[PDB]
């Protein structure tokens, strides 16, 4: 019935020295039934990632919506869409919503082409614009992301540090989740490299 | 009633010209001069205020308009056409970019949207198109600063230096020799001075000349201070003063 | 009332022409040269600037060469505004076509939506036509590299070379003697600029005056790459040639 | 909207922009249609004025409306395609509601309704 | 409705679908085919509520037809999935909604693959070696996950959605009359009239 | 979200605390509520985040627009209408509680506005889960006369009492000192009374700790020539 | 020959409807003025009353648009009656919209643009007026703001309207190049008034009674038109020096 | 807590100035009294959204007559705010007490509670507060009172008004509207509390 | 040429010659007149007898207005009330908001705005009609005249159609020979006699006489028709003059 617990799954994000990390479990569930085990819920638009929760028809759709977005942006400016603009993006747009929303959790992370500054940001359904500095969470299991994050992070990790604290942080908060888990991915973002892996994680 | 104007007023002719358009462009030759140069470090943009009688208060008539804290925009041809394009210029700044990226749009889009309105009214039922055309300076992060000329048929060109209106032929040939890619703003005002003192016949002093720079930021003009990566704008309208001081060492 | 100012824009000759059409055509005529040549890998878009100036800042110019999406490209003559509004709309086309299929748009099914609009103009409405003719350059997996042409009557047709705008007919009976099926991308760029070289209305064809665009398999693997040539490369390659 | 009547009559019963119209065929590349004992075969005449054309991506003149019904005509190639994408509609329109492709003559008398409603219809010619 | 089922082999999707059509208490017929043709190389099964489930499957047939005439070519199997998709996700905001699940089954004749998508009347698209909608799920899904293996023959293909029928014939309340499989492959769309 | 405004001599100031909320879980430890209408003309909101967030960005371009239009300096009664026409336009749905304050041609001004679209006036005023517990000081501490120390100094304190008294508020002190013929000064963690200690444990943990299945590289950059 | 009587460009770059519009504007053969003092701006207009059976309280061509903007109109007065309705509207829906009352300037900007459509739009015809707005501007203080039918205006220290602007005009010219200031130094408007008057008088080669002037002031909030005996007043007091 | 009372010399109308959301004042210094013209004024209560709202366009409306048909009739003001708050009555709480002073006819009293109706009285009371004192203001209530006993017995009423009545408090605003103009009077709690 | 072939075009003069025309559709009319006395206002009209075949006091052509409002025209007579169709929703509107009957002045701005709007397109042709109304509202009598371009003035005495110099000649008399001013039953008779004196100019076919009246102290401040006996001692009065 709560439509951003139906599918379940989880997204985290956090910044570390000149790099980003994003990461996702790979579950899509109708509530107790496991369904797929290869759901990614990240997504790139040039050198910008967005990590989508929430109910899955949504996810797919808001994806759908902002490679088209980002896809005409880059005819017209003739050059790839930055993190904090996207961010303005996103928020415009679950905010032209505001009175039947799309029932996700989205989080923006990449580095800036020209300043090289790694950046993060979650969002409401609404659109409503959080931009912390250390770590962004969503999903079905925020409150264990929260406690994970909050204890396992510190600033300015080195790019194969802040790939064990993220994967950690998030494989003990799914576990800890029934709709959550099934597989994960973590992507190490730096200026002009990215790192994809897949983490071994239990199967129930 | 009901406007039942729904054709276009702006039709091909035989031999391939569209009339309402070339019409336009000659009611902008006979508009007052303006000018666009470009320096390394800044654009300039001037104009002459001529004043319709002295009673006037010419002040009170903005031939310069700033459009973004980054983008001014002059004309020659029709003033009032030109002051409802830099309302709906400035409205659509904000509208079709400034509400969804949450940042003024790069000089090269306003001009876009600028352009799509004239040429609405080329093709759009029950209208005529607007008899100006537009120079629009500005800077974006992303293209530095650059300057634009816009014609009442929605066509627009970027330019190193240009004039428009009366005595643009003679101006142009005139920026033509001073212009080289190396000039300061500082010298791209002298020669924006110098081009302008030809095409003015009487008075020519701070009070006859408006005269606006997008240059370096302006903390100074921000309004408020606490946000270090806002700087204040890149547009300056020269002061009456500012022109004059310039005119001694001319 | 109104009636007596509506010029009827959309209405047969005695002839069973349309008028605003072949005056739309007519203007087209007098804009810069625009040449699509297709290769066996690859096209090529040449396309002249109008008399330009020494003023005119060329690096952050284009009048002549779009992107649709990054398959396609459109060569454009004739009222460059006009223009600008039909390519957006055909850039919608192109990324409601990937939202809704997850598939880049067949280059033919996006110039038949540009040539029905175009066709709209001069059926219904009361309005002028769009005063603008396209090259259209792109490759699909359907049918591989494709170039056409729409006009505005919004007639759409396919080329292995044609030319759109000034001289026409000149340029059209150049590519004709030179054109060979088993052409490769480096000679249909040479076909190009010999072309427009004796068919252009200036002294001598020169960098500042080009803008000019390859559509190439030329990317590392089963992949396709656009390139719109930067003022010092259409510079290099005008030298490459041997016509400066 | 453009509610102009462009299709008049004139003081001797004509309506004009019909007639204008047909002249628009006449000025078409030549078709022909002959039916035998169990078959029909449609043919087009293709101008050669324009050689240096491709004829795998070029329109062609017989377009299928359904897999059972093709469409071959005379005139504006641009007004053609309206007309096709209207009876390719119709087409299946009619198989979802009647259970049953249409007959010839049922898609005939279709775009046949299509060209006489532009003939008194304000806006359109 | 209730009993959709479908399996990725090697070389072909097999689509099984229940005949049983039941409104209160009564099995009002016991032979439906709950699946329409969407093109030569794609197939929609479907279930949901009463008069939706056709209205829709027929609504995207006629839709696939015309894409098809128009363009005289067949979508890939992923191009109509992303169709339907769609459709769906527009519908689930809709006034009233279309409450229709559906599995697509297709052998794309670019790739030489065959491919399952399943998708929820809310628009939730997946590709799956095997999938199933409603309460069915509950039981094959475990099962598959034994006894699948990704280079299975259509043979095995078969006896292994036997396997997945007599569990539901063991275990589910209500009486669904038997399935009708069918094999979609590089040949086409074809019934098993011996099941 | 504990928010105050507080008038004086020559001028109108504005607080607020530093946390933003889901639920009795914190998003944001130093989010800042401190919004600008225009260069002059602040406010700070409660209530639906996003809500606040997009009035004060809609009503601050129409204002922008509207000062370019009639070539002034924008004032606070125009911020004060848009948003209460909008607000009651929209009959409560836009969760919306903002405290405005600016200087302008007129002077200083001072305001509040609810959901519903009622406005307020006085020369203190509170907002938020933490409105009572700064009401209580500035009741305690407010006098006629103050001056821009005073009212700084009466403003934090009214936000500390939020941020300790009410769960719904923490962290940092924001303040904006809107004065006459002066520049807005947006003292972005004016306060910092919350930093969190030095943590017994580093928990950086060993490379190779994590199980990998599969690596990959990425290609984020477009099609490359040749 | 039909750009002439739509608004859409002549060959030489021309609307003749505009034109035409401004000729409109002389009809009613009547000579506007208005000057700026320290605290008020005064305007004065000719009162031709040429029918006995007219009721003459009734004939004005002044307007009192909001509290603190007066609007004195060269033209028919249809149209000028059309523009006085239009002001009062957009004065009104202004202040309650935005909280304060429109400035004189900003309404003339408005009443331009509004016109500005009517030369760009073929189904409206120009108003054949002139539109002279004033008031003491709470920002600007005194102000006089001009529109036209071409969709111009622009801000004033003094300005005339009517057959015989050109030597009101110049009359007005003369006297500021003498005293080089951009108004009348003087404390309060009933000498702002006199010295109006006065001057129109030396201009026009022609004396008044009480009834052959109207008269708009405008202070610091309030704009208020005087009686025939107000105005009386104030000939006796320029004859007695 | 809102009343008016029309006297020899002209109208008063009185008001509390709390402001309170449940049972928190949310300001206890509030103006409850509102121009409508130069001397036509409303008291406002019920909703503070819903009385500023209408407030705000009565203003307005007279603001327009003004400019177009000179001074409105205090009856015409009452009017305005019968017509708004009657096709308005679903999405209205709001009870309006407008008080006015002309020439011809002097001071004038209108009442307009939830319904939307019209009521012209020789004095009004209105707002939470009014309940407990129906019975002290009809027994000290006469006609041809002084300015002096009218801001006497409006004192009095208000005084015992915010004494029983949580929902009221704060200072006592009256305006006094005369041929002489508009004048302002506050009456503080020490005043009042000990009459 | 041409700028007269089409409604809100204007001359090369600065003119609206669809308006003019319009003027000339009036000129041609029956003789309608006005006449503003003490406390009130007086309405009168020529009616030409076609033939014996129209029923004697049957054909009315003056309209009321609300209650208080007299409105009479000359010109095409369809126009004319089209137009007091709309006044009397003008008047029914501002009633409803504003409680107070229409003061006058604010009824002919309601009338002059409309006619005016009719001047400002080409697909609607101006009013054929001068239109002469007015009543008693708070601040007394008022007396209008309303013209095809939408101008209109206050008048001591107005008239329009084909006999209006001869009628504008006798109501200068009078405003010169009654500066003190006119009573309601005075203006009675001199409505009468300036009908039968502004009738030589349409002297073929005999006619019928029409008055109304809106008095503060005759008719309480209401529009009534005179009837019976007040209006046969005004046509005594008035065939008495001419003789
Ligand atoms: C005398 O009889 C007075 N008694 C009090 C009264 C409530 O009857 C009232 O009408 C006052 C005065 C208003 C003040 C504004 C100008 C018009 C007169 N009415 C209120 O104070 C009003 C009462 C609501 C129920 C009657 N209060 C509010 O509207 C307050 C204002 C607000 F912002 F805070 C929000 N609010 C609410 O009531 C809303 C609905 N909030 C809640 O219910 C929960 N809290 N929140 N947010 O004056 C009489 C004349
Ligand atoms: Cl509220
Ligand atoms: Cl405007
Ligand atoms: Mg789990
Ligand atoms: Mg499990
Ligand atoms: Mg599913």
Request: aromatic share 8%; proline share 3%.
């Amino acid at each position: 019935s709560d439509p951003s617990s139906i599918n379940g799954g989880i997204v985290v994000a956090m910044t570390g020295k000149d790099c980003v990390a994003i990461a996702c479990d790979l579950r899509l569930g109708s509530q107790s039934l496991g369904v797929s085990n290869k759901f990614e819920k990240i997504f790139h638009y040039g050198h910008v990632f967005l990590g989508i929760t929430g109910l899955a028809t949504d996810v797919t759709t808001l994806n759908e919506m902002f490679r088209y977005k980002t896809n005409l942006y880059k005819l017209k400016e003739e050059r790839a869409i930055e993190p904090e603009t996207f961010t303005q993006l996103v928020s415009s747009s679950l905010y032209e919503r505001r009175f039947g929303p799309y029932f996700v959790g989205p989080v923006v992370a990449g580095i800036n082409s020209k300043s090289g500054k790694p950046f993060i940001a979650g969002f409401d359904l609404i659109g409503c614009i959080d931009e912390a500095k250390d770590f962004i969470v969503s999903g079905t299991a925020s409150d264990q992301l929260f406690g994970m994050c909050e204890s396992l992070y510190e600033p300015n990790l080195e790019p194969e540090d802040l790939f064990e604290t993220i994967s950690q942080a998030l494989l003990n908060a799914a576990d800890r989740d029934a709709l959550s888990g099934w597989g994960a991915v973590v992507y190490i973002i730096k200026k002009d490299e990215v790192v994809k892996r897949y983490l071994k994680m239990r199967q129930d | 009633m009901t406007d039942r104007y729904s054709f276009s007023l702006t039709t091909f002719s035989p031999s391939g010209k569209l009339g309402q358009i070339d019409y336009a462009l000659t009611a902008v030759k006979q508009g007052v001069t303006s000018l666009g140069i470009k320096a390394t470090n800044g654009v300039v943009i001037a104009t002459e205020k001529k004043s319709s009688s002295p009673l006037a208060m010419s002040e009170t008539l903005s031939k310069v308009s700033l459009l973004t804290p980054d983008i001014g925009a002059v004309y020659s041809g029709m003033g009032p056409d030109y002051r409802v394009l830099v309302d709906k210029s400035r409205k659509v700044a904000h509208t079709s970019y400034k509400r969804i990226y949450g940042e003024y749009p790069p000089t090269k889009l306003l001009v876009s949207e600028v352009a799509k309105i004239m040429q609405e009214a080329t093709q759009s039922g029950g209208v005529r198109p607007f008899g100006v055309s537009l120079l629009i300076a500005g800077h974006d992060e992303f293209n530095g600063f650059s300057l634009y000329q816009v014609d009442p048929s929605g066509s627009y060109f970027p330019w190193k230096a240009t004039a428009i209106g009366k005595g643009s032929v003679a101006a142009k040939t005139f920026l033509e020799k001073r212009w080289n890619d190396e000039l300061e703003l500082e010298d791209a005002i002298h020669i924006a001075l110098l081009t302008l003192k030809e095409s003015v016949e009487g008075e020519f002093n701070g009070d006859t000349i408006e005269l606006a720079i997008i240059g370096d930021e302006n903390p100074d003009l921000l309004g408020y201070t606490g946000i270090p990566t806002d700087k204040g704008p890149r547009f300056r309208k020269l002061t009456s003063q500012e022109i004059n001081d310039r005119l001694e060492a001319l | 009332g109104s009636r007596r100012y509506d010029s009827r824009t959309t209405i047969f000759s005695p002839e069973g022409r349309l008028y605003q059409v072949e005056y739309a055509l007519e203007s087209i005529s007098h804009a810069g040269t625009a040449i699509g040549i297709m290769a066996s890998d690859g096209i090529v878009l040449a396309a002249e600037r109008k008399v330009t100036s020494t003023l005119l800042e060329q690096d952050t110019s284009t009048e002549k060469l779009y992107k649709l999406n990054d398959k396609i490209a459109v060569a454009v003559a004739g009222l460059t505004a006009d223009a600008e509004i039909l390519i957006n709309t055909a850039r919608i086309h192109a990324q409601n076509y990937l939202k809704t299929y997850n598939e880049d748009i067949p280059v033919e099914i996006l110039v038949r939506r540009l040539s029905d609009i175009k066709q709209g103009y001069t059926q219904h409405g009361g309005l002028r036509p769009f005063g603008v003719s396209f090259i259209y350059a792109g490759y699909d997996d359907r049918y591989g590299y494709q170039l056409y042409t729409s006009n505005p009557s919004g007639n759409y047709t396919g080329w292995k070379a044609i030319s759109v705008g000034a001289n026409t007919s000149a340029a059209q009976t150049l590519l004709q003697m030179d054109y060979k099926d088993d052409m490769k991308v480096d000679d249909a760029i040479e076909l190009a600029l010999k072309t427009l070289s004796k068919t252009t209305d200036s002294s001598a064809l020169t960098y500042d005056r080009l803008e000019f665009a390859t559509i190439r398999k030329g990317a590392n693997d089963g992949e396709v790459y656009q390139k719109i040539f930067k003022p010092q490369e259409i510079k290099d390659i005008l030298v490459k040639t041997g016509i400066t | 909207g453009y509610d102009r009547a462009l299709s008049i009559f004139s003081p001797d019963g004509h309506i004009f922009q019909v007639e204008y119209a047909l002249e628009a065929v006449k000025r078409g590349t030549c078709a022909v249609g002959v039916k035998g004992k169990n078959c029909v075969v449609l043919g087009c005449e293709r101008r050669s004025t324009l050689k240096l054309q491709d004829t795998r991506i070029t329109p062609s003149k017989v377009s299928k409306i359904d897999s059972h019904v093709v469409l071959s005509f005379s005139g504006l190639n641009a007004d053609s395609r309206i007309l096709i994408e209207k009876a390719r509609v119709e087409a299946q329109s009619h198989r979802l509601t009647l259970e049953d492709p249409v007959t010839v003559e049922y898609l005939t008398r279709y775009v046949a309704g299509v060209q006489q409603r532009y003939t008194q219809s304000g806006g359109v010619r | 409705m209730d009993i959709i089922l479908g399996i990725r082999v090697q070389d072909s999707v097999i689509l099984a679908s229940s005949k049983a059509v039941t409104r209160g208490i009564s099995v009002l017929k016991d032979s439906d085919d709950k699946t329409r043709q969407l093109s030569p190389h794609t197939l929609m099964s479907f279930a949901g509520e009463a008069g939706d489930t056709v209205q829709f499957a027929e609504y995207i047939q006629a839709n696939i037809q015309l894409y098809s005439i128009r363009e005289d070519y067949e979508l890939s199997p992923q191009a109509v999935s992303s169709f339907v998709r769609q459709e769906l996700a527009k519908s689930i905001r809709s006034r009233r909604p279309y409450q229709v699940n559906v599995l697509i089954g297709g052998y794309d004749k670019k790739k030489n693959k065959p491919e399952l998508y399943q998708i929820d009347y809310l628009g939730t698209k997946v590709e799956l070696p095997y999938g199933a909608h409603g309460y069915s799920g509950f039981y094959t899904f475990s099962l598959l996950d034994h006894h699948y293996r990704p280079d299975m023959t259509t043979e095995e293909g078969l006896d292994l959605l036997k396997l997945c029928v007599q569990e539901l014939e063991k275990r589910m309340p209500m009486d669904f009359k038997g399935v009708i499989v069918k094999i979609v492959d590089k040949d086409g769309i074809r019934q098993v009239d011996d099941f | 979200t504990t928010i105050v405004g507080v008038k004086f001599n020559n001028g109108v100031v504005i607080a607020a605390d530093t946390r933003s909320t889901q639920g009795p879980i914190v998003a944001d430890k130093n989010c800042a509520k401190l919004h600008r209408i225009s260069p002059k003309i602040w406010c700070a909101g409660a209530g639906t985040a996003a809500d606040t967030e997009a009035v004060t960005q809609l009503i601050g371009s129409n204002i922008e627009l509207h000062s370019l239009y009639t070539s002034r300096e924008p004032r606070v009664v125009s911020a004060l209408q848009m948003l209460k026409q909008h607000l009651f336009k929209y009959q409560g749905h836009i969760g919306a509680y903002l405290i405005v304050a600016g200087v302008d041609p007129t002077g200083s001004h001072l305001f509040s506005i609810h959901a519903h679209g009622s406005t307020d006036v006085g020369y203190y005023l509170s907002l938020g889960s933490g409105s009572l517990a700064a009401m209580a000081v500035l009741e305690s501490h407010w006098k006629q006369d103050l001056t821009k120390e005073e009212a700084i100094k009466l403003a934090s304190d009214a936000i500390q009492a939020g941020i300790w008294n009410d769960l719904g508020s923490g962290s940092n002190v924001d303040v904006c000192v809107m004065e006459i013929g002066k520049d807005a000064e947006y003292l972005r963690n004016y306060l910092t009374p919350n930093v969190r200690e030095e943590k017994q444990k580093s928990y950086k943990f060993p490379r190779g700790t994590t199980a990998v299945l599969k690596e990959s590289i990425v290609n984020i950059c477009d099609i490359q020539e040749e | 020959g039909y750009d002439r009587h739509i608004t859409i460009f002549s060959p030489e770059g021309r609307l003749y409807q505009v034109e035409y519009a401004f000729k409109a504007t002389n009809q009613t053969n009547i000579n506007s003025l208005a000057v700026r003092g320290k605290d008020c701006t005064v305007v004065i207009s000719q009162k031709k009353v040429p029918d006995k059976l007219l009721d003459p309280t009734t004939v004005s061509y002044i307007f009192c648009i909001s509290r603190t903007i007066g609007m004195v109109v060269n033209g028919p007065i249809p149209d000028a009656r059309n523009a006085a309705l239009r002001a009062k509207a957009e004065a009104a829906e202004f202040r309650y919209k935005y909280g304060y009352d429109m400035p004189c300037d900003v309404l003339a900007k408005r009443m331009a643009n509004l016109s500005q459509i009517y030369t760009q739009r073929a189904y409206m015809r120009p108003l054949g007026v002139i539109l002279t707005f004033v008031s003491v501007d709470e920002e600007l203080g005194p102000s006089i703001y001009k529109t036209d039918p071409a969709g111009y205006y622009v801000g004033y220290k003094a300005t005339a309207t009517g057959p015989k602007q050109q030597e009101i005009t110049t009359n007005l010219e003369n006297h500021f190049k003498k005293s080089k200031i951009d108004h009348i130094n003087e404390e309060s408007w009933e000498k702002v008034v006199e010295f109006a008057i006065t001057h129109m008088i030396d201009a026009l080669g022609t004396e008044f009674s009480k009834n052959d002037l109207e008269v708009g002031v405008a202070t610091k909030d309030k704009f208020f038109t005087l009686s025939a005996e107000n105005i009386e007043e104030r000939l006796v007091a320029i004859a007695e020096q | 807590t809102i009343m008016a009372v029309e006297f020899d010399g002209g109208v008063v109308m009185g008001s509390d100035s709390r402001v309170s959301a449940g049972e928190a004042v949310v300001n206890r210094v509030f103006d409850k009294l509102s121009p409508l013209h130069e001397r036509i004024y409303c008291a406002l209560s019920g909703s503070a959204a819903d009385t500023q709202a209408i407030a705000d366009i009565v203003q307005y409306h007279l603001e327009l007559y003004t400019s177009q048909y000179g001074t409105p009739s205090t009856e015409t003001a009452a009017s305005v705010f019968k017509e708004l708050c009657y096709e308005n009555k679903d999405n209205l709480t709001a009870g309006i007490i407008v008080a006015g002073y002309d020439d011809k006819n002097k001071g004038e009293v209108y009442t307009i509670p939830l319904g939307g109706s019209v009521h012209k009285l020789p004095y009004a009371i209105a707002g939470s507060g009014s309940t407990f004192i129906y019975g002290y203001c009809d027994k000290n209530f006469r006609e041809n009172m002084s300015k002096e006993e009218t801001v006497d017995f409006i004192k009095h009423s208000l005084s015992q008004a915010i004494k029983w009545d949580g929902s009221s408090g704060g200072v006592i605003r009256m305006v006094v509207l005369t041929a002489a103009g508009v004048e302002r009077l506050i009456f503080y709690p020490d005043e009042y509390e000990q009459l | 040429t041409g700028y007269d072939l089409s409604n809100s075009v204007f001359s090369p003069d600065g003119r609206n010659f669809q308006v003019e025309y319009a003027v000339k559709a009036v000129e041609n009319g029956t003789t309608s007149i006005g006449i503003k006395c003490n406390d009130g206002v007086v309405f009168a009209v020529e009616k030409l007898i076609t033939s014996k075949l129209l029923v004697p006091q049957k054909n009315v052509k003056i309209q009321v207005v609300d209650r208080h409002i007299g409105c009479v025209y000359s010109g095409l007579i369809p126009d004319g009330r089209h137009l007091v169709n709309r006044g009397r929703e003008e008047a029914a509107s501002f009633k409803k908001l504003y409680k107070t009957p229409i003061p006058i002045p604010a009824f002919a701005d309601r009338l002059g705005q409309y006619v005016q709007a009719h001047t400002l397109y080409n697909s609607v042709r101006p009013f054929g009609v001068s239109t002469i109304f007015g009543g008693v509202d708070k601040n007394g009598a008022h007396l209008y005249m309303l013209e095809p371009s939408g101008s209109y003035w206050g008048y001591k005495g107005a008239a329009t159609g084909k006999g209006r110099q001869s009628a504008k000649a006798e109501l200068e008399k009078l405003v010169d020979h009654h500066p003190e001013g006119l009573s309601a039953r005075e203006a009675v008779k001199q409505a009468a006699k300036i009908i039968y004196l502004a009738h030589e100019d349409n002297k073929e076919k005999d006619f019928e006489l029409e008055i109304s009246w809106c008095s503060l102290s005759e008719t309480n401040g209401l529009h009534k028709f005179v009837k019976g006996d007040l209006l046969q001692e005004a046509i005594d009065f008035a065939q008495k003059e001419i003789n």
